Amino acid sequence: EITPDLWQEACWIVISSYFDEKGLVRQQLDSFDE
């Protein structure tokens, strides 16, 4: 179902998930590993 106006929680949950999956130095580590 849609998320009407209860959207700040989801908006920051997705960002927290992103930053848990990928850190802050992802580009350098990925480039060196490749």
Partner: protein, 49 residues
């Protein structure tokens, strides 16, 4: 044998790869250290993109 290549810290070929925070603390390595830099002559070097 060809030569030695420095390794970016916290990479796939770094000794500190996938270790838990307990192991890092046991190795006197901060778990909050982001890695992503080389150690040349004991100095931390970073590459600007």
């Amino acid at each position: 044998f060809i030569g030695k290549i420095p390794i970016m810290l916290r990479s796939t070929y770094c000794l500190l790869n996938g270790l838990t925070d307990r192991d890092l603390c046991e190795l006197n390595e901060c778990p909050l250290d982001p890695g992503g830099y080389f150690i040349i002559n004991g100095s931390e070097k970073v590459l600007i993109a």
